[PDB]
Amino acid sequence: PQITLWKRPFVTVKVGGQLKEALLDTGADNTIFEDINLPGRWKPKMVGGIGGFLKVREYDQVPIEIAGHKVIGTVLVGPTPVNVIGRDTMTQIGATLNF
Amino acid sequence: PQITLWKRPFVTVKVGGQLKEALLDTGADNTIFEDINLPGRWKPKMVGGIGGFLKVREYDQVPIEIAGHKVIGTVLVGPTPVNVIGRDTMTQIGATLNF
């Protein structure tokens, strides 16, 4: 799709079998969800944005269905106020900015 | 321009006469800079990042030169770790996402 930015750029995503909405976020290096449970081992990580830092779990090689593509990427899980799709996932679907 | 997202999408801007770089950030509703000085009245505001909230000053009707366009918009000023260009500014230059 092509979208303008008059509204928040939410997309519907299936991540580890779980349906979620997430913000296409060109200012986010990684992808982040709250309230999903993913199997297997993970590693601890922290991330920073405005406001401060969020504590997360990092899962590698997780399935993400997004914009008709199936991608396998890293997902961070922690109590973000909104779910975000970062550049790590958007590069895999060839997303571009036009301005 | 059209850009991919393999690197962080920085752009050079002039905001209230000061040159800065800022991240084109589709996940940000508003535009925020650190360490700029703007004249005149302002209103207090907070913004919630992933971390909670950053305290800012809100300036209305501020010049921003971005991507060969000159726009007038609202700018928030406060100690963000990275300057961002949000959707309030990007809609004024007709930016779009393709994915």
Ligand SMILES: COc1ccc(S(=O)(=O)N(CC(C)C)C[C@@H](O)[C@H](Cc2ccccc2)NC(=O)O[C@H]2CO[C@H]3OC[C@H](OC)[C@H]32)cc1
């Ligand atoms: C109402 O208006 C705004 C309200 C909030 C923001 S924001 O900066 O908090 N933000 C809101 C998002 C989270 C819904 C914009 C994001 O694009 C933000 C923009 C950003 C970029 C860098 C530093 C701080 C913030 N990036 C981060 O949350 O990125 C996180 C996740 O990926 C990592 O890469 C960059 C960060 O690593 C530091 C990590 C901006 C305008």
Ligand SMILES: [Cl-]
């Ligand atoms: Cl890992």
Ligand SMILES: [Cl-]
């Ligand atoms: Cl990694």
Ligand SMILES: [Cl-]
């Ligand atoms: Cl980069």
Ligand SMILES: [Cl-]
């Ligand atoms: Cl300071």
Ligand SMILES: [Y+2]
């Ligand atoms: Y990793």
Ligand SMILES: [Y+2]
């Ligand atoms: Y400073």
